Amino acid sequence: ELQARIAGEQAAIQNETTKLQMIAQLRQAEQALISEQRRERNMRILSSGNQGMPTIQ
């Protein structure tokens, strides 16, 4: 019974390892998404579809 308990404990540590891998992937995805938002803002400022300009009055 103690051997099987220790085996279950190893399985739990395995699960934590998988969870940490998943957290690292999510971290990378979040950084990529922040970069995408930055580039969306940049595109919106510099878009050639803009039609406005200051008016002389």
Place this chain on the structure above:
Amino acid sequence: AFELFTPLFNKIDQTTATYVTDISSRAIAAITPVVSVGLTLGFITYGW
């Protein structure tokens, strides 16, 4: 749309009208009657 030279030209035209054309018109209109009568009377007097 892009409108920069139309507003600028209209602004400059307004400045030239109010400050170079109207002032000249105001001065000439004020002196035209008086100078007219004075010149006519001077003509008569000098002739005599």
